[PDB]
């Protein structure tokens, strides 16, 4: 059984009129796997959210299914789903009644609604969060204690030089006694391997912000995820990289015409036909 | 006996030339009720201020009265009036002698001299201090412990909602479970009375700055006190309210002509004849 | 024996390419008196700097002298001169080898190289440091305990008035009871001597910044030291004062023509012929 945005109660007894409040509490995540026998309880319809008992009574007409829609549960005293800590965006009507909600943890175009604090997202690119490649490796090197890995974000320790970055073969020749180099910004640029005296280059791991490519919410809900400055080989529809990074959820049409939505650094995006395509401008 | 600005001694042994220094010490307030038998002592004339003994010897020619003028008392060793903590503005001559002083606690147009730090106030409006209506009441409401007061600044406590404001009947209908409302600025806007379930509106009490309406000190000393944003029913010659607040010390002439001194928000003030009048611009 | 910039070792084992690093460590000062038998050790050539043993082997061809040039000593393990704490400016080549160094504590035009962080100083005036006349005297005066000194920077204490300045005869007459005066900036301007009741004027001692007058390093190395706002009677080639202060290392040519290098406040400086001259603009 799929919960079509069913369990949304009033977190506090505060009156709000025509606002979009952001609440951090225990709510039922939208489109969650619900058994078909805090916790959510529904019986075909008297919905109950226990945490404090919330109740709601809605007339229904269906068989062997869960009703689709939205219903706010009211505090009573001070199908089963489980509650999780989520950040919800509640829409309060002019009478204080919650008419709609957005769970900003399920899929893209939902975090964009939280970032913009609106149920209608315009046509464009929006930077929602960032992305840092976490090092899934840890190597330590000491002279004559693990193997040397390269071309991957790894926490290294070269005879006391603790750092975080990706190692690669450098074309710089150090002096016979110098053990590590430094750039203009007073940061460790290259290190000398205590074994085999190999010179390795240190590069900071991929640091970029994620962006959602949306052709407005009035046309369709199909969005594309855009990563800035990172390669998709390190990123956890169609996967393809571009000049600005990797774009998930679009196509790689070889055509080229006028730019529609500038995603940044060359390539632009557009909506065509029921499919999002990318083209070089 | 009236002290015509008599007791003003040298607070410290510091030499100053052509300055207007502000001193916070124990001085005799100007135009104070002096007995006709720290303390001020005068005998018709050898004035003494004890606190440290200050002395002054001035030739006088009068009977059954106190001499009018100004005389600075000099430190001697390390009619009777009493000293109070006052903020005085002393005028030092080119030889270090105090020639005049202003007690900025007696009447309006004297605090203006301290605010401007000058013995000559120009023609215009000057904001000297502020004014906050202190709540002369404290009510506490709990469900089934004092009476409910409205239309007056009162400290309230609605089942744990401690605040300060004026309560009035609101036209907003809360939900059957919501107990208090909140505006866009994340402040308590309305509360629900735990008794009779009446909805009350919370409004911050009158916050405004006082202003002195003076037609310059070269013409006359008659000034008018202007309160901004407050009603004279809550404010502790002629009393009348205007669009910018309450104006004390003027008239309410129904005539209208060109503006002379803009007191703010419409109405202007002018000097006519030996009387200060107000007129809508 | 004179050390012609001989002892300069690698402070740390860090690789740098085409940079000018500033190091604070124990180095041999340039042009220092070296015996002709941390410490510097050279033998005609295998130079050794002990601190950690640094070594260097350079072919030489000379007799009864010390070789002139520059040679960087490399770390080996973990004529005699002594090491002192100095701030050196090291020039790293594209291979990490130190090719030249500047000791910014020997003479002027060397501190300018540190201030500009370059081995080539342009033609102009550069403010390197400041200059405050330290009081070489301390007098204390109490009423009926040292002699009264004037026209010299001295720490004074007049019956509890501790301060620092130069005392001189003031033409201001205090009141018979006032002991010290104060200016507009709320600072002690004048004091009354508890003995003989003499009025003295307090003036802050000479505060100014030093400046190096250099006609560029591409033409010659002869520079002139310029002090701003101080008189040479208090300052520790040809000494002469000007409108902007005292200028050491130049001439006082009475001629006057177009300005070449504005040293500030009137007088300008120029290079003529092998001699630095100053002239009123
Ligand atoms: C530390 O030990 C390693 C392991 O023997 C040394 O690596 C070898 O060095 C020799 C001498 O140059 C080479 O012939 C081998 O091919 C190296 N081994 C590998 C797997 O390449 C290393 O040189 C030693 N380092 C020091 C400083 O002694
Ligand atoms: C708390 O007690 C008060 C006092 O009885 C209640 O106020 C009365 O409520 C009844 C029921 O509606 C009215 O008929 C009366 O007119 C009310 N009294 C007055 C003076 O107006 C109040 O309703 C009670 N509240 C709760 C929540 O029980
Ligand atoms: C403190 O003592 C000194 C020393 O005697 C006094 O200085 C003398 O004062 C007399 C009286 O005016 C003069 O005739 C002398 O010429 C002063 N001495 C010198 C060396 O000039 C001083 O006046 C005394 N101060 C007080 C306040 O008593
Ligand atoms: C709020 O309540 C009033 C009460 O009559 C009703 O007329 C109005 O339609 C309600 N608002 C909404 C959005 O339902
Ligand atoms: C992105 O990084 C991966 C790392 O595996 C590399 O193989 C690829 O060539 C990189 N692409 C670009 C365009 O830098
Ligand atoms: C200050 O003293 C001098 C002394 O002769 C006198 O001439 C002058 O008038 C005095 N100043 C004032 C304002 O009285
Ligand atoms: C000012 O406040 C008093 C409160 O008693 C009220 O009666 C009056 O109507 C108010 N006047 C205006 C102009 O708001
Ligand atoms: C650095 O080393 C390379 C190695 O061949 C050499 O060609 C180059 O001249 C060196 N650089 C300097 C400044 O000597
Ligand atoms: C500079 O100070 C000395 C102090 O001994 C003084 O003699 C000289 O007249 C002063 N010169 C100028 C120009 O102020």
PDB file of C-alpha atoms in Angstrom, chain A residues 172-175 177-182 184 186, chain C residues 10 12-16 19 74-75 95-97:
ATOM      1  CA  UNK A 172      57.678  18.272 -10.733  1.00  0.00           C
ATOM      2  CA  UNK A 173      61.161  17.234  -9.597  1.00  0.00           C
ATOM      3  CA  UNK A 174      61.844  17.930  -5.929  1.00  0.00           C
ATOM      4  CA  UNK A 175      65.277  18.376  -4.410  1.00  0.00           C
ATOM      5  CA  UNK A 177      66.012  16.317   0.501  1.00  0.00           C
ATOM      6  CA  UNK A 178      62.670  18.113   0.067  1.00  0.00           C
ATOM      7  CA  UNK A 179      59.701  15.964   1.089  1.00  0.00           C
ATOM      8  CA  UNK A 180      56.647  18.055   0.167  1.00  0.00           C
ATOM      9  CA  UNK A 181      55.798  21.142  -1.857  1.00  0.00           C
ATOM     10  CA  UNK A 182      53.611  24.170  -1.221  1.00  0.00           C
ATOM     11  CA  UNK A 184      51.170  30.294  -3.297  1.00  0.00           C
ATOM     12  CA  UNK A 186      50.334  28.161   1.637  1.00  0.00           C
TER      13      UNK A 186
ATOM     14  CA  UNK C  10      67.362  25.811   3.625  1.00  0.00           C
ATOM     15  CA  UNK C  12      62.631  23.706   5.909  1.00  0.00           C
ATOM     16  CA  UNK C  13      62.329  20.851   3.418  1.00  0.00           C
ATOM     17  CA  UNK C  14      59.522  22.474   1.424  1.00  0.00           C
ATOM     18  CA  UNK C  15      59.546  22.705  -2.377  1.00  0.00           C
ATOM     19  CA  UNK C  16      58.873  26.184  -3.779  1.00  0.00           C
ATOM     20  CA  UNK C  19      58.498  32.563  -4.992  1.00  0.00           C
ATOM     21  CA  UNK C  74      71.674  21.604   2.053  1.00  0.00           C
ATOM     22  CA  UNK C  75      70.602  19.497   5.055  1.00  0.00           C
ATOM     23  CA  UNK C  95      63.811  23.785  -9.227  1.00  0.00           C
ATOM     24  CA  UNK C  96      63.544  24.711  -5.538  1.00  0.00           C
ATOM     25  CA  UNK C  97      67.130  25.992  -5.306  1.00  0.00           C
TER      26      UNK C  97
END
